[PDB]
Design a protein around this ligand. Structure first.
Ligand SMILES: CNC(=O)[C@@H](C)[C@H]1C(=O)/C(=C(O)/C=C/C(C)=C/[C@@H](C)[C@H]2O[C@@]3(C)O[C@H](C=C[C@@]34CO4)[C@@H]2C)C(=O)N1[C@@H]1CC[C@H](O)[C@H](C)O1
Ligand SMILES: [Mg+2]
Ligand SMILES: [Zn+2]
Lengths: 12, 86, 53, 95, 1119, 158, 263, 105, 85
């Protein structure tokens, strides 16, 4: 399910 | 078992005949895994390749015939008369 | 095309579909909704049924 | 249409065979110049700007004017595939 | 000649300016000829006003007010004629005086700012975009307002729908579901109708009894009694039932959006939307939609009526509220204006966006002018709407008639916000309303039925695109002469009577009379008749109303007959029909083929080139006559001058005619002697046989022009020249190439010839060894350049009639990047009438020329006169268009009597009257003989023996007499000019107008044998010279497959297309003289393996045993 | 053999079958004016009527030909394979009396006129409907026909 | 990777999907190398995982777009295979034939079933090379390339070629096709009798076969190159041999319209 | 020579994936502009996918049929005209694997 | 960024040109001839230069894109071949 958020999330 | 014309074709042995549709993804995913050899039987499947139609004059039953004149018909036995070792 | 028995090595298959597909364009025959019917249409005619078949 | 297409369609076990046979013989009727023909002397092939069909017009019209007259021979497996082209290139001049 | 018209229903009022739909609109659209002082703020003035006051208050610093003062246009960059010689649009200057305010010191006022250019409409109606006449096709859509439609899946009750335009105007729906939930989907997801009904003070005590106490559905409203207890809270409560992340305290936040400004608003206060809103339901609505902001407290004169009507609908009988979504009182047409004005406001958006950023970039006071607004936006969209807009295409101008019917065509397909291409079935049907609004025949044929349509002759868009139609009033017996063009909706309201209703001056003349009550054919009583129909003309479109006996032609054919006309190629020997509907002059006069004169005067100098009128006001004006000009289609347009020298002209009377203009009437074909009978199978199915006599007298000949072009590409291998150098074989080929570079005027240019010479550089990056040694032996100093000269495409080419160059020092052109110079060699040809061509009459007998016969042996009358064309009868029984058979009978009498006829649509001539003319004809035909001193052929007497057993003549009467009876039926005794022997049986003959048809580019009998091929796929392709290959369709595959045609099929799958190794081997094989090389493989397959291989899937072929076989012949064996 | 107007001949038994059926029609609306028939029965009673009346003259026209003008062109093209549909001759001479609405529910009122005399204005417009009605469907069974014929060759070639 | 109008360059989107993939995969290693913070190693491996499918097949998880201009689907792999954009349709909508020709048809009354009539101007292109060769056989041209030139401009064609074109043809036949080929009769073969003009003279009897009238239908001609093909064509596919319906007993070529009328 | 009679689909083992390779594209470069030539180790290349012009070499170290099935040292380019350049394939050795989406969705 | 590698040099340079293109859009009105732009930019800037700088500053058009009466007919099939005789 759509990348970006995961990483932006995984970072945070 | 009785099945509609569509479904009846979308299940044939050869993946080639079965790819001439718009589901070519599933059709392919199975042929691989399976290691399927599309014995080219039908025509469609046999056209994609560029082969010669299995029917018409593409009929093995006639694919290989031979012609000759009685002048030559004789000339081949002469190729047998020369078998007389001296 | 002749009248003699069928000849071996003939594409009966395709020659079939074709025949059964040409007339095609020449069928169909009605069925819509009149004026509030407590009923259900039964006789499917034309191409639409041939398919259903 | 074509002279005795029926008689021709009747001297074989399948429509699709007569074709091959006339086809194959026609190719060889060229492959090997035009003397491997099974007939010639009198009334045979002909054109008209001058009577020149006697030499090289239609390949196949010949195949059909020969195979029609009971002179040629053909079978499912009559004479060994390779030594055929051999003798044929050996008895008929033309190139 | 003499012109006698027929039948009479005193046509009360003339047809409308057949282009009003186009001109008139674009007018009101962009009022450039009236000062901002004038009182009209629609379209252009509206869009502007609506998109200017940009009050960006606080987001830092600014509070900059930017208003509009005076918009204006003035002087186009170049004239029309020039806009087609070169390749530019026909624009105009467009700026307006702007000024911005400072919440400090200064209100700078920087006037003129041309933010782009807006196209203009010709006096005729079309535009000019890049050299080609373009036209904008009218469009229909869902009239904004409210409608109640039967709920989709639940045969229970019905739902509601709110429709705004712009699309930004929320498309709302209503629906109820009793056990606890009601619905209303503005944006999407449902929620309490009262949830928002409370956002406007509307409480559950005043709402439950003063709205639906007559409705048991009010209980579905009171439901959530909890939220129903807080005013300006439901404004945040509902604000919450949305989803972004937003602040719950944004006061007049999004409730503004559903207020005034951009979203819900319709064009202009008064009728842009209130008509629907009001007439249909409710009573009033101040401002546009739910608009207001002066108090903070909202008013929704929108949501109350809708429920007060749905609950009024789903119950009782207010009337019969259901709504026919296809009624023309519910469907609207958007003229060119709206279509432009709207695409003109999308531009003010991209601008208003690029500008908002600049209010946050500028230093301080140097900002009004260019530091705030740039043209790049508006100038790219508008341009986009004229250049690519699906709803805009080439000007079908084969002939005047065409460019007229086009201009006034209507298409459903368009914005996409309006009817797409899935639907149709019911929206395609002709509606009970199209009567007198849209033709019931004109529409196209095929995948595009009913979506594209053309309107009626009298129809016209009143005020807000609700196609009306001329209807006149009748008080009791009394029948008005006054007309009230009525809208769809406000039509059903009355009992309209048909036009062909017996009259006594102003009194209907029969106890019973047919009228139509809302699409219901009824036989009524005079005193009942409230309105009558102006005339038949109003029921049908234009093209159709040009057909003779329409009333006798199966509407199914009326279409062919009506479209044929459009394909009417402008014959040099133009000619008006021996029988005319009436609109003959109107079409020409109203389109712009012929050149008429303003006011009275005389004639100065009539030059095949110029006409100078001698007005009696002292002045004199020259009138240029486009001589041999090129039309988009190619059919030439030449205004030949009719008025002699120093002739005392009469205002409005034509001076010169146009392409299809004969004396001033519409000449699309040529009246010609036809004899409808069979021939030696020459007119077998739909074929036609002709009288070569038609050729001898340049009759069906037309002037066509072609325009070939070429550029001097600026490759990086050396500039391309356009010299007179053909490096290889002859001067005999240079001949006509007189001039250095281009071709000489008036030189026959048969195909294969050199229209222009050019030269680029042979090899990509290198010469050639093999060729190296060859060129040296005969003169190594062989100009190593390529002959890439433009030649006459196979097929044909006439004679050079005018050329155009554009070398360096470019005047004002726009040579593209890499374009050093373009050249043009226009060519013209006098296409004569020849076999393979198509002809047709306005009834639909569309047929193709199959045999040209020598006068000497085709059907001849008794007195030497030989017919021109022979039509087969078998073509008329089935196509139930007997109409054409009346045209010939009436036509014959038109011959021998030497006179014309007008036969109005329905009120025309009748069998009897015609039967009379035929008799008065029989004299000129037979009376002569009796006097020239001759009796009756020993043949005529013989045919008369047969002509009775047939039963076409009263036995016993005198031979002389017998022929009259016969001739009167339309039949005569024709002789077979090949024998002298009589066609045993009388045959009908007579004059039939027959038009020639314009040859599509498909006509160009193509033919290929060897040609290029795509870079990628390797299947054949054509271009400039070589013809493109033929596509061997699947069905074509089956046919062959079905046949024993085994090989023949593989031929098509390889040699003739997909085999690189093949065709190659193949070509040569032939030349030398051998049976083609057994087919390699198709690339299509090879491409599949590698294509498939790009995907981790391996596709490897196999053998007898499961052992490999290499398709890509060894080239895939690594290194 | 050709085609002049006097070729499509109309039988004197047209005004008859028409008039006689105008009264049997009047009768019905009385049996309606009172209260005996249902609105739905009123309607079907009618169609029923015409449909028969229509059919009636179709044979009338033909018999006229058979008996009085066996050698008429229109007749002769129709009789031999040549070209001619009975339902077409009817249109020409007798009458094309019953088109239908967009709906599907045929019109209550017939189209008395024939292509020979002036098939009136509103009569013309009435028949128009069946124009698109038929153009639609046709551009469809050509499609689906194809569609199907592909399926057929697919489950068949081999 | 093509060159077009000046700086204009053309290239299958595929190349762009690949690059994508490469740069990622490359940033991969190069990232791992330089130490390795976890979050990132995956983030990149994640991105990569997306790229890997990109070229394989788009839209099955998302749609990547060339930088702005067209929100177009960079045509991934299967898309070309399957024809997920009518590609297959046009694919099994046949290719193109090298020796084809299409014209307008016209009735050939006194013609004979056995034959058909096409315009020379057409025939000329058709069996062009078969003509070149005959051209060299007669004295109207010494050698090929030469002869080629002869037949390049209409004005330089000696009226001796036509006689040559007549030769070539003699014996030979071609095939004519109708718009919707619905049955085997749909394509029939005749030995062309070179005619004049721009039109194809078709035989009345077969008009039943090809549903074809003469108000503007156009037929197409096909040249059977192979001595074999030509061979079958004029034996089992020559109109005059298929008079009956393969669909039902009833004959297809039968006295029609006007003809009946007379008899 | 041998008449193919049966076709066969199967999964591409990295062995058979590499096998097909005539090199491993190891860089994103397409073609630099100063010259219409394929860049270094990129999607296009004389070494990998083959020659660019007929029998001619990459730098013209060789230029004829005589030196048919043999290769060059300085640049590297077996050769028969361009035609091979469309039939040849290459790979991209990935760092961490990823599966054929086809098999996952 | 692009499909055809361009140097950093001829990058910082394209941006100027994109920019200068606007400064000229600012006052004249006529989309600058390769002269206005040239003069404006700097020293060694001719007319052939700017014209040449842009064809390169372009973007490869998709070999696969809707052509003509866009429906099925795919671009690529309109491009011929040359290597193959
Ligand atoms: C594929 N068919 C089905 O699945 C059938 C079984 C089912 C069905 O779902 C049908 C349709 O979805 C029809 C859609 C139509 C006619 C759309 C218009 C817009 C068409 O208009 C034209 C203009 O363009 C296109 C195609 C053809 C057109 C008409 O010419 C376009 C598609 C249909 O007819 N069916 C049955 C058949 C028996 C009966 O009719 C019943 C009421 O319905
Ligand atoms: Mg037709
Ligand atoms: Zn090298």
């Amino acid at each position: 399910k759509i990348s970006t958020s995961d990483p932006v999330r995984q970072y945070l | 078992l009785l099945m509609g014309v569509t479904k009846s074709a979308l299940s044939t042995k050869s993946w080639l005949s079965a790819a001439s549709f718009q589901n070519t993804t599933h059709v392919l995913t199975e042929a691989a895994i399976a290691g399927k050899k599309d014995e080219l039987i039908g025509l469609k499947e046999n056209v994609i390749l560029g082969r010669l139609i299995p029917a018409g004059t593409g009929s093995d039953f006639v694919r290989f015939t031979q012609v000759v004149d009685q002048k030559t018909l004789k000339a081949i036995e002469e190729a047998r008369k020369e078998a007389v070792e001296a | 095309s002749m009248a003699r028995p069928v000849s071996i090595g003939e594409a009966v298959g395709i020659v079939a579909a074709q025949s059964i597909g040409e007339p095609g364009t020449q069928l169909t025959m009605r069925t819509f909704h009149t004026g509030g019917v407590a009923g259900a249409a039964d006789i499917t005619q034309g191409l639409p049924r041939v398919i259903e078949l | 249409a074509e002279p005795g297409i029926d008689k021709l369609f009747g001297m074989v076990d399948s429509k699709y065979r007569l074709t091959v046979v006339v086809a194959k013989r026609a190719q060889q009727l060229l492959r090997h110049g035009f003397k491997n023909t099974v007939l010639e002397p009198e009334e045979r092939p002909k054109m008209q700007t001058l009577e020149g069909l006697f030499d090289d017009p239609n390949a196949e019209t010949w195949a059909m004017k020969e195979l029609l007259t009971g002179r040629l021979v053909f079978g499912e497996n009559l004479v060994p595939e390779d030594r055929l082209q051999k003798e044929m290139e050996r008895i008929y001049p033309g190139e | 000649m003499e012109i006698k018209r027929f039948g009479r229903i005193r046509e009360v009022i003339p047809l409308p300016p057949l282009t009003e739909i186009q001109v008139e609109s674009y007018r009101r659209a962009l009022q450039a000829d009236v000062p901002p002082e004038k009182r009209e703020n629609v379209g252009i003035q509206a869009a502007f006003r609506e998109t200017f006051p940009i009050e960006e208050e606080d987001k830092g610093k600014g509070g900059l007010v930017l208003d509009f003062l005076e918009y204006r246009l003035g002087e186009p960059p170049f004239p029309q004629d020039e806009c087609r010689e070169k390749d530019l649009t026909y624009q105009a200057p467009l700026y307006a005086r702007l000024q911005l305010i400072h919440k400090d010191t200064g209100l700078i006022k920087e006037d003129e700012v041309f933010l782009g250019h807006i196209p203009l409409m010709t006096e005729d109606g079309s535009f000019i975009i890049n050299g080609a006449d373009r036209v904008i096709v009218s469009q229909i859509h869902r009239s904004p307002g409210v409608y109640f439609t039967p709920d989709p899946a639940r045969p229970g009750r019905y739902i509601a729908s709110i429709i705004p335009l712009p699309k930004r105007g929320p498309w709302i729906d209503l629906e109820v579901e009793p056990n606890g939930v009601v619905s209303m989907k503005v944006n999407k997801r449902k929620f309490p109708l009262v949830l928002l009904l409370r956002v406007l003070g509307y409480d559950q005590e005043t709402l439950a009894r003063e709205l639906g106490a007559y409705g048991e559905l009010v209980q579905g409203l009171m439901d959530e009694s909890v939220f129903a207890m807080r005013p300006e809270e439901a404004l945040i409560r509902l604000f919450t039932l949305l989803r972004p992340g937003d602040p719950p305290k944004r006061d007049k936040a999004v409730a503004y959006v559903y207020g005034l400004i951009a979203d819900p608003r319709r064009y202009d206060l008064g009728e842009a939307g209130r008509y629907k809103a009001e007439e249909k339901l409710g009573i009033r609505l101040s401002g546009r939609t739910l608009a207001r902001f002066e108090d903070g407290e909202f008013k929704d004169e929108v949501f109350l009526p809708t429920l007060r009507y749905l609950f009024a609908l789903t119950a009782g009988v207010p009337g019969h509220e259901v709504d026919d979504i296809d009624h023309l009182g519910n469907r609207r047409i958007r003229t060119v204006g709206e279509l432009m004005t709207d695409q003109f406001r999308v531009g003010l958006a991209r601008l208003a966006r690029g500008v908002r950023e600049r209010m946050l970039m500028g230093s301080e006071d140097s900002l009004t002018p260019a530091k705030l607004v740039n043209s790049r936006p508006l100038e790219a969209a508008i341009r986009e709407f004229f250049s690519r807009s699906q709803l805009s295409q080439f000007k079908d101008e084969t002939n005047p008639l065409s460019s007229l019917r086009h201009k006034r065509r209507i298409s459903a397909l368009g914005p996409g916000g309006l009817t797409r291409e899935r639907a149709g079935f019911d929206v395609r049907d002709v509606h009970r309303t199209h009567y007198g609004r849209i033709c019931p025949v004109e529409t196209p044929e095929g995948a595009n039925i009913g979506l594209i349509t053309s309107l009626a002759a009298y129809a016209r868009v009143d005020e807000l695109g609700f196609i009306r139609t001329p209807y006149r009033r009748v008080v009791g017996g009394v029948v008005t002469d006054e007309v009230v063009y009525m809208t769809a909706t406000e039509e059903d309201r009355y009992t309209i009577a048909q036009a062909n209703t017996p009259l006594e001056g102003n009194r209907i003349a029969a106890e019973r009379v047919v009228a139509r009550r809302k699409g219901e054919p009824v036989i009524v009583s005079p005193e009942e008749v409230e309105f009558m129909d102006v005339s038949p003309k109003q029921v049908f479109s234009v093209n159709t109303n040009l057909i003779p006996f329409l009333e006798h032609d199966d509407a199914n054919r009326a279409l062919m007959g009506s479209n044929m006309q459009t394909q009417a190629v402008p014959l040099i020997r133009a000619q008006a029909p021996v029988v005319m509907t009436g609109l003959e002059e109107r079409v020409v006069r109203d389109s712009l083929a012929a050149l008429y004169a303003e006011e009275d005067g005389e004639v100065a100098k009539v030059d095949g080139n110029r006409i100078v009128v001698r007005y009696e006001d002292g002045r004199l004006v020259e009138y240029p006559l486009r001589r041999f000009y090129r039309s988009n289609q190619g059919t030439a347009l030449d205004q030949r001058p009719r008025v002699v020298v120093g002739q005392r002209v009469r205002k409005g009377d034509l001076l010169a005619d146009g392409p299809a203009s004969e004396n001033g009437f519409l000449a699309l074909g040529q009246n010609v002697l036809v004899a409808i009978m069979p021939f030696d199978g020459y007119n077998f199915e739909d074929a036609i046989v002709i009288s070569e006599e038609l050729l001898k007298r340049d009759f069906y000949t037309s002037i066509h022009i072609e325009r070939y072009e070429i550029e001097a590409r600026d490759t990086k291998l050396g500039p391309e020249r356009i010299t007179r150098d053909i490096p290889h074989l002859s001067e005999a080929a240079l001949r006509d190439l007189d001039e250095e570079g281009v071709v000489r005027i008036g030189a026959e240019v048969k195909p294969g010839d050199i229209l222009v010479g050019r030269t680029s550089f042979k090899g990509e990056s290198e010469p050639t060894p093999e060729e190296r040694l060859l060129r040296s032996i005969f003169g190594e100093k062989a100009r190593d350049v390529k002959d890439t000269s433009l030649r006459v495409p196979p097929g044909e080419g006439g004679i050079v009639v005018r050329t155009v160059r554009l070398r360096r020092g470019d005047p004002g052109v726009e040579l593209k990047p890499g374009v050093r110079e373009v050249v043009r060699v226009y060519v013209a040809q006098k296409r004569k009438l020849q076999v393979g061509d198509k002809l047709a009459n306005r009834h639909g007998n569309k047929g193709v020329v199959a045999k040209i016969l020598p006068v000497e042996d085709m059907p001849h009358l008794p007195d030497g006169t030989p017919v021109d064309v022979i039509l087969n009868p078998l073509g008329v029984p089935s196509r139930m268009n007997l109409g054409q058979i009346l045209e010939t009978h009436l036509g014959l009498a038109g011959y021998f009597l030497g006179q014309r006829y007008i036969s109005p649509i329905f009120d025309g001539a009748k069998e009897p009257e015609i039967k009379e003319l035929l008799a008065q004809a029989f004299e000129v035909y037979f009376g002569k003989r009796k006097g020239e001193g001759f009796g009756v052929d020993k043949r005529e007497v013989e045919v008369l023996r047969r002509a009775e057993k047939l039963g076409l003549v009263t036995p016993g009467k005198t031979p002389e007499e017998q022929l009259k009876e016969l001739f009167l039926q339309g039949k005569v005794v024709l002789y077979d000019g090949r024998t002298g022997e009589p066609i045993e049986g009388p045959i009908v003959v007579g004059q039939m107008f027959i038009m020639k048809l314009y040859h599509m580019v498909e006509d160009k009998m193509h033919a290929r044998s060897t040609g290029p091929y795509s870079l990628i796929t390797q299947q054949p392709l054509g271009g400039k010279a070589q013809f493109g290959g033929q596509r061997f369709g699947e069905m074509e595959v089956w046919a062959l497959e079905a046949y024993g045609a085994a090989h023949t099929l593989q031929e098509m799958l390889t040699l003739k297309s997909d085999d690189i190794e093949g065709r190659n081997a193949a070509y040569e094989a032939i030349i030398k003289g051998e049976d083609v090389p057994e087919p390699s493989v198709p690339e299509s397959f090879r491409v599949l393996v590698k294509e498939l291989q790009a995907l981790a899937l391996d596709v490897q072929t196999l053998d007898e045993k499961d052992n490999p076989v290499d398709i890509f012949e060894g080239l895939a064996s690594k290194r | 053999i050709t085609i002049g107007i006097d070729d499509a001949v109309i039988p004197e038994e047209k005004k008859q079958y028409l008039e006689e059926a105008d009264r049997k029609l009047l009768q019905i609306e009385q049996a309606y004016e009172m209260g005996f028939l249902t609105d739905r029965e009123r309607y079907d009673q009618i169609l029923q009527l015409w449909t028969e009346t229509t059919e009636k003259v179709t044979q009338a026209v033909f018999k006229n030909f058979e008996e009085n003008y066996p050698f008429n062109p229109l007749y002769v093209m129709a009789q031999s394979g040549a070209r001619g549909n009975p339902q077409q001759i009817r249109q020409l001479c007798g009458l094309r009396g019953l088109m239908q609405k967009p709906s599907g529910e045929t019109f209550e009122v017939p189209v008395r006129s024939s292509f020979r005399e002036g098939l009136t204005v509103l009569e013309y417009f009435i028949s128009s409907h069946g124009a698109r009605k038929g153009g639609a469907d046709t551009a469809l069974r050509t499609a689906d026909s194809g569609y199907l014929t592909r399926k057929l060759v697919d489950v068949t070639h081999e | 990777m093509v060159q077009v109008d000046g700086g204009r360059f053309a290239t299958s989107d595929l190349n762009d999907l690949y690059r994508r993939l490469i740069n990622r995969n490359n940033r991969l290693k190069k990232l791992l190398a330089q130490g390795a913070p976890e979050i990132i190693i995956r983030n990149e491996k994640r991105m990569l995982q997306e790229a890997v499918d990109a070229l394989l097949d788009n839209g099955r998880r998302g749609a990547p777009v060339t930088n702005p201009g067209s929100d177009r689907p960079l045509r991934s792999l299967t898309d070309i295979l399957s024809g997920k954009q009518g590609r297959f349709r046009q694919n099994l909508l046949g290719k193109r034939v090298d020796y084809s020709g299409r014209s307008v048809i016209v009735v050939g009354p006194q013609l004979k079933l056995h034959q058909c009539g096409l315009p020379k101007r057409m025939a000329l292109e058709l069996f062009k090379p078969f003509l070149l060769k005959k051209m060299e056989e007669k004295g109207i041209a010494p050698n090929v390339k030469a002869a080629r030139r002869m037949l390049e401009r209409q004005r330089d064609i000696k009226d001796e070629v036509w006689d040559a074109l007549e030769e070539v043809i003699h014996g030979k036949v071609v095939l004519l096709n109708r718009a919707p080929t619905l049955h085997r009769l749909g394509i029939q073969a005749f030995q062309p009798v070179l005619v004049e003009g721009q039109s194809i003279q078709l035989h009345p009897l077969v008009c039943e076969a090809f549903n074809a009238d003469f108000d503007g239908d156009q037929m197409a001609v096909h040249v059977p190159l192979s001595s074999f093909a030509q061979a079958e064509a004029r034996i089992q596919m020559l109109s005059a041999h298929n008079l009956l319906s393969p669909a039902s007993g009833e004959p297809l070529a039968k006295p029609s319209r006007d003809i009946i009328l007379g008899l | 020579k041998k008449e193919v009679r049966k076709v066969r689909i199967a999964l591409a083992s990295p062995e058979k994936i590499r096998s097909w390779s005539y090199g491993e594209v190891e860089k994103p470069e397409t073609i630099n502009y100063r010259t219409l030539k394929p860049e270094r180790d990129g999607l296009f290349d004389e070494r990998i996918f083959g020659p660019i012009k007929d029998y001619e070499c990459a730098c013209g170290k060789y230029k004829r049929q005589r030196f048919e099935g043999k290769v060059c040292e300085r640049c590297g380019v077996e050769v028969t005209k361009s035609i091979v350049r469309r039939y040849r394939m290459g790979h991209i050795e990935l760092a961490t694997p990823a599966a054929h989406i086809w098999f996952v969705k | 960024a692009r499909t055809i590698r361009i140097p950093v040099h001829m990058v910082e340079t394209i941006n100027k040109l994109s920019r200068t293109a606007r400064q000229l859009q600012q006052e004249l009105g006529r989309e600058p001839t390769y002269e206005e732009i040239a003069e404006a930019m700097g020293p060694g800037w001719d007319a052939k230069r700017v014209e040449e700088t842009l064809k390169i500053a372009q973007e490869p058009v998709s070999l696969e894109t809707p052509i003509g009466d866009e429906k099925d007919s795919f671009y690529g099939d309109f491009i011929p071949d040359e290597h193959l005789p």
